[PDB]
Amino acid sequence: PTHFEKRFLKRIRDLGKVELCRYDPEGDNTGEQVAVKSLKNHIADLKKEIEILRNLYHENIVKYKGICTEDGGNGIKLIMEFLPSGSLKEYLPKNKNKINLKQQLKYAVQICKGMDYLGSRQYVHRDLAARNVLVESEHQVKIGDFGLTKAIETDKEYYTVKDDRDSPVFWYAPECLMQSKFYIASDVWSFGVTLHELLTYCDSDSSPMALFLKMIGPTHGQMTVTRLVNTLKEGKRLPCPPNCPDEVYQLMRKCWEFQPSNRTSFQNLIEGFEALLK
Numbered sequence: 654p655t656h657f658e659k660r661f662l663k664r665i666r667d668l669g670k671v672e673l674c675r676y677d678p679e680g681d682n683t684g685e686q687v688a689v690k691s692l693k694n695h696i697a698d699l700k701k702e703i704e705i706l707r708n709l710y711h712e713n714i715v716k717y718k719g720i721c722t723e724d725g726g727n728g729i730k731l732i733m734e735f736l737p738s739g740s741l742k743e744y745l746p747k748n749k750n751k752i753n754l755k756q757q758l759k760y761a762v763q764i765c766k767g768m769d770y771l772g773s774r775q776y777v778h779r780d781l782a783a784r785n786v787l788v789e790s791e792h793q794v795k796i797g798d799f800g801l802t803k804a805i806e807t808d809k810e811y812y813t814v815k816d817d818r819d820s821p822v823f824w825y826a827p828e829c830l831m832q833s834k835f836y837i838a839s840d841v842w843s844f845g846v847t848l849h850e851l852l853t854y855c856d857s858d859s860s861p862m863a864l865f866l867k868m869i870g871p872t873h874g875q876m877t878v879t880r881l882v883n884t885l886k887e888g889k890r891l892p893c894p895p896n897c898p899d900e901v902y903q904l905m906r907k908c909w910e911f912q913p914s915n916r917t918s919f920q921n922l923i924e925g926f927e928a929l930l931k
């Protein structure tokens with residue numbers, strides 16, 4: 654009762670590959686809408702993500718629904734619940750009006766809960782950005798993609814990633830950029846950046862990529878990571894968004910301590926934000 658027949662998954666539109674499908678075995682279009690993750694070779698990677706998501710059960714983590722086999726039973730698809738409001742990246746610009754600071758801080762708490770739960774299971778997300786934070790409702794958010802998530806080996810503080818794959822470098826901590834080492838503290842750094850996005854209502858002009866590119870200047874490509882490391886070494890950071898209170902920025906800056914050991918924890922973040930609400 655967690656297997657989806659590929660012929661029954663009717664594609665609607667791309668979500669991010671991740672596609673919106675309607676699983677409709679009765680053929681009367683009454684079937685339920687679902688998010689489907691497939692390959693655009695790296696079947697072993699998607700199988701790892703499936704094992705990860707099936708093992709996550711939390712209010713602030715997108716629900717695993719099942720798996721769809723691509724014949725001759727040689728391919729796999731990840732089936733997830735579909736949240737129509739989409740990611741913060743698409744939702745926040747559309748609702749700058751109803752979403753105040755209180756609501757943004759509740760989202761920050763929820764992301765931190767989802768991430769702390771992820772941390773307790775010994776995983777590093779390595780891709781925490783607003784595009785990966787889904788809106789269940791105006792009161793609830795969920796971490797919605799685990800495509801770069803890795804399990805930290807027992808008795809180790811981090812996972813080392815040595816591959817030819819792409820990385821969200823404008824969300825990465827110094828240790829990730831310099832040594833390819835990913836700690837729970839590196840996810841804390843990425844949360845800080847995600848929180849910046851959320852506070853700027855995911856305005857494209859104020860995105861971490863747009864701001865850092867304006868700081869770094871004209872840059873290839875192959876030199877982006879070095880220029881970014883240098884900027885972070887000098888102590889430069891994403892500026893406090895307009896009308897962002899000191900208390901929130903101070904928490905945001907604690908996610909951005911150059912050394913991983915000097916950063917705050919997700920639990921200290923939960924408590925910090927919760928103390929600001931009402």
Ligand SMILES: CN(c1ncnc2[nH]ccc12)[C@H]1C[C@@H](NS(C)(=O)=O)C1
Binds near residue numbers: 737
């Ligand atoms: C937007 N989105 C989703 N939207 C609605 N309902 C969903 N259920 C699950 C995912 C999902 C996912 C595509 C992922 N983002 S990406 C391509 O940058 O990795 C997040």
